[PDB]
């Protein structure tokens, strides 16, 4: 997955999340055409109760059927207020995508953090299965007092081995715009004056 966010001078907005699924997809290149094919089928449930690459399970609703779209976690988002765009954001991360967007939203709207800080802040993830397991990344690992306290409650803390998203976001404050690119990745933002 990767994500990008765009606002134009008219106040129109695009939030676009797209993917091959895993990095470089199936690894199959269409000979003569040069592009990689996705391995998106792994987002179906292959067998009830068996976890896929992201640790999520399913049953009949997300079983494989011909012509069926496989369940996604991708969540390209646009927040508005007063009928005008105020925040455009999205991210990769598989089953971590909507919990990372949730956290960034809390950081912006509950803790009132500058957008850059809201995106740079530590993010963690829990998804019921594996049982009581909280994932962190090496960018901002769970450590120290907070880690000890969560472990004392009975949580297992695990470094998932890849960064916990890559938020690309735009905030509109009145007529002014600012951008934030996640420090976990190589993103770049620009405000474009007409």
């Amino acid at each position: 997955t990767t994500h990008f966010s765009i606002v134009d001078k008219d106040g129109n907005a695009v939030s676009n999340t797209y993917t091959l699924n895993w990095d470089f997809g199936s690894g199959v290149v269409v000979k003569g055409a040069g592009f990689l094919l996705n391995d998106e089928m792994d987002d179906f449930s292959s067998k009830p109760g068996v976890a896929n690459a992201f640790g999520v399970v399913g049953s009949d609703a997300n079983a494989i059927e011909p012509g069926k779209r496989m369940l996604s976690s991708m969540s390209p988002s646009i927040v508005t207020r007063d009928g005008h765009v105020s925040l455009v954001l999205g991210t990769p991360g598989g089953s971590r995508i909507f919990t990372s967007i949730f956290q960034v939203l809390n950081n912006v709207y509950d803790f009132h953090l500058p957008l850059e800080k809201a995106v740079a802040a530590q993010r963690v993830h829990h998804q019921l299965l594996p049982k009581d397991t909280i994932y962190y990344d090496a960018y901002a690992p769970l450590t120290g007092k907070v880690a000890d306290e969560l472990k004392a409650m009975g949580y297992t803390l695990e470094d998932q081995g890849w960064n916990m998203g890559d938020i690309q976001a735009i905030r509109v404050n009145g007529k002014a715009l600012e951008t934030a690119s996640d420090p976990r990745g190589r993103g770049v933002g620009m405000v474009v004056k007409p």
């Binding site: 990767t2 990008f4 765009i6 129109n12 999340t17 797209y18 895993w22 470089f24 997809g25 199936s26 690894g27 290149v29 000979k31 055409a33 040069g34 592009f35 990689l36 094919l37 996705n38 998106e40 089928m41 690459a53 049953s59 009949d60 609703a61 997300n62 494989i64 011909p66 012509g67 069926k68 779209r69 496989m70 996604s72 976690s73 991708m74 969540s75 988002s77 646009i78 508005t80 207020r81 990769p92 909507f98 809390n106 950081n107 509950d110 802040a121 963690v124 829990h126 049982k131 007092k145 907070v146 969560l150 735009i170 990745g185 190589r186 993103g187 770049v188 933002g189 405000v191 007409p194």
Partner: protein, 335 residues
């Protein structure tokens, strides 16, 4: 009318192209289409024309959602990745041609542009064509992903024949992809789903024993859908509906957190209590996700019930602010 446009892109090339389009008078959709094709060249680990995705839009004061997610081939079956002992075959759904759904990206970018674009289609592909022909600089993280993928593919595909020479800080050129993008610029999605590119994809499938056929590509359609709308604290969030699980999840996450506001009062960001509370909410979200959610044309997904405010309040009442809830007692909420 704003003080300008803006782009936040996952690399410097998508950012530059998006800004060039906005400066040339393109709108956000024009810019988005050019950016998406650019990243299919410079960000091939995820940017793509052989995959799929979702686009959430706000145009002239109204929200829209475009679903260009891949679809299972017509020959796919429920048990296609199980072996003769009923076991899931390791990496068969991850590596090789049978792991692929019918790609949707080229159709999705076309439909977005057809509905909302102001600039000419072929012009929106010229930047991507330029990066395919004269190259882009490979990134450190990109190279690391290349190394991991080689390891996962385990020499079972042609990956190395095309991406084996990616070297960080060194220019990478993709001549065959340049020609493919030129056909898409000239012919539209017709090339990808019905023309020369379609034929090359089907020949790859036949060689590798994949399932995608001409009939699969001719039948692919992107789908416009009503976006998920979530209101809280006077803001209106538009996000992905089914077949994304993220819109229902965000509705439940936000709604349950609001119901439990008293427990979040005076709680610092990423304190143990904060992270515990989020984990308690995520327990219920993922219980419902696993049980109910999927392509909404293939079962009667109870979306209204799973986002009903009274249902949100019932699930919020399950949150234990002081201790971990017994995992075996967390149920899908309509059971």
């Amino acid at each position: 009318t704003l003080d300008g446009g803006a782009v936040a892109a996952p690399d410097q090339y998508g950012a530059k192209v998006a800004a060039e389009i906005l400066k040339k008078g393109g709108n956000a959709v024009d810019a988005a289409v050019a950016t998406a094709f650019t990243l299919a060249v410079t960000y091939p680990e995820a940017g793509n024309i052989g995959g799929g995705g979702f686009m959430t839009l706000y145009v002239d004061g109204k929200p829209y959602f475009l679903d260009y997610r891949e679809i299972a081939p017509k020959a796919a079956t429920k048990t296609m990745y199980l072996n003769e002992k009923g076991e899931v075959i390791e990496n068969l759904s991850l590596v090789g041609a049978k792991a692929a759904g019918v790609p949707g990206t080229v159709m999705g970018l076309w439909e977005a542009h057809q509905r909302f674009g102001k600039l000419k289609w072929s012009e929106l592909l010229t930047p991507a064509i330029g990066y395919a022909q004269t190259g882009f600089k490979v990134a450190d993280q990109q190279y690391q992903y290349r190394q991991d993928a080689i390891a996962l593919f385990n020499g079972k595909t042609n990956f190395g024949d095309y991406f084996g020479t990616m070297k960080p800080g060194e220019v990478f050129k993709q001549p065959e992809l340049a020609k493919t993008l030129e056909r898409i610029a000239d012919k539209g999605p017709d090339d990808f789903y019905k023309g020369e590119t379609a034929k090359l994809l089907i020949a790859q499938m036949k060689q590798d024993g994949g399932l995608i056929t001409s009939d699969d590509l001719v039948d692919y359609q992107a789908k416009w859908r009503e976006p998920m709308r979530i209101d809280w604290q006077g803001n209106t969030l538009y996000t992905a509906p089914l077949p994304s699980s993220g819109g229902i999840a965000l509705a439940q996450l936000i709604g349950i957190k609001e119901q439990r506001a008293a427990d979040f009062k005076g709680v610092e960001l990423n304190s143990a209590k904060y992270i515990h509370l989020l984990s308690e909410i995520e327990k219920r979200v993922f219980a419902d996700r696993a049980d109910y959610l999927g392509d909404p044309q293939f079962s009667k997904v109870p979306v209204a019930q799973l986002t009903d405010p009274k249902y949100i309040a019932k699930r919020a009442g399950e949150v234990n602010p002081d201790a971990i809830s017994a995992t075996e007692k967390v149920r899908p909420g309509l059971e």
